[PDB]
Amino acid sequence: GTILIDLSPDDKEFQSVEEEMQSTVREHRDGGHAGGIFNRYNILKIQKVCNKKLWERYTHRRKEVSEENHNHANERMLFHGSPFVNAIIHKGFDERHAYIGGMFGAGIYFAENSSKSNQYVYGIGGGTGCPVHKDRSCYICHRQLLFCRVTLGKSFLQFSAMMAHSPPGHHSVTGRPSVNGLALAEYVIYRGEQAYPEYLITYQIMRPE
Ligand SMILES: Cc1cc(=O)[nH]c2cc(-c3ccc(N)cc3Cl)ccc12
Ligand SMILES: [Zn+2]
């Protein structure tokens, strides 16, 4: 059901998506352990993901959340990295994409910092790094992240010192770092229908000069 349309680097759409990737890189407290060492990406391809059935599943849930709020979907564009990105684009998000061990509960996690999502491309904590070289800081192998449309509705704010249900009357959780003043938020949803994988971004991290 899914089809991928390649965006031209000359298209303003490709260029705004690239800008959101590049401008939300930050340094990580693990010194690059999980995601590698870099300040910016080499973007190789940006594809728009088109699936009628998944889109209708998304907009159907969105209208429901919308109505339970002050007519407010609270829709964001957020990053998601995972070994399962090729499966998500075909069958959608579900409970098997849930982070059982997550600090904000057993749901699906999205990030404002693209570099936070980059830490999960090869698994929790970066797994063992790329398949070919077993290198979490690999500058050669091609990586992929999703840039997703996410319905937050009434989000429960949880300050952080850095499939389950949302707290009563809430549609998601906001995990907001309170120690690192440069770290942006993560968000957790507990229903797969609350996210749509809009763009598939293929890239390399760049070795600093
Ligand atoms: C915080 C966060 C951001 C993100 O962009 N992606 C994630 C993915 C996982 C996750 C969950 C289950 C499994 N099996 C694998 C993986 Cl990589 C967790 C956490 C995140
Ligand atoms: Zn590699």
UniProtKB/Swiss-Prot annotation:
Highly expressed in placenta, skeletal muscle, liver, brain, kidney, heart, thymus, spinal cord, lung, peripheral blood leukocytes, pancreas, lymph nodes, spleen, prostate, testis, ovary, small intestine, colon, mammary gland, breast and breast carcinoma, and in common-type meningioma. Highly expressed in fetal liver, heart and brain. Ubiquitinated at 'Lys-48' and 'Lys-63' by RNF146 when auto-poly-ADP-ribosylated; this leads to degradation. Deubiquitinated by USP25; leading to stabilization. Residues 8-209 form the PARP catalytic domain. It is found in: Cytoplasm; Golgi apparatus membrane; Nucleus; Chromosome, Telomere. Zn(2+) binds at residues 130, 133, 138, 141. Poly-ADP-ribosyltransferase involved in various processes such as Wnt signaling pathway, telomere length and vesicle trafficking. Acts as an activator of the Wnt signaling pathway by mediating poly-ADP-ribosylation of AXIN1 and AXIN2, 2 key components of the beta-catenin destruction complex: poly-ADP-ribosylated target proteins are recognized by RNF146, which mediates their ubiquitination and subsequent degradation. Also mediates poly-ADP-ribosylation of BLZF1 and CASC3, followed by recruitment of RNF146 and subsequent ubiquitination. Oligomerizes and associates with TNKS. Interacts with the cytoplasmic domain of LNPEP/Otase in SLC2A4/GLUT4-vesicles. Binds to the N-terminus of Grb14 and TRF1 with its ankyrin repeat region. Interacts with HIF1AN. Interacts with RNF146; this interaction leads to ubiquitination and proteasomal degradation. Interacts with NUMA1. Belongs to the ARTD/PARP family. This is Poly [ADP-ribose] polymerase tankyrase-2. It comes from Homo sapiens. The lineage of its organism: Eukaryota, Metazoa, Chordata, Craniata, Vertebrata. The gene is TNKS2. The chain holds residues 952 to 1161 of 1166 of the full protein.
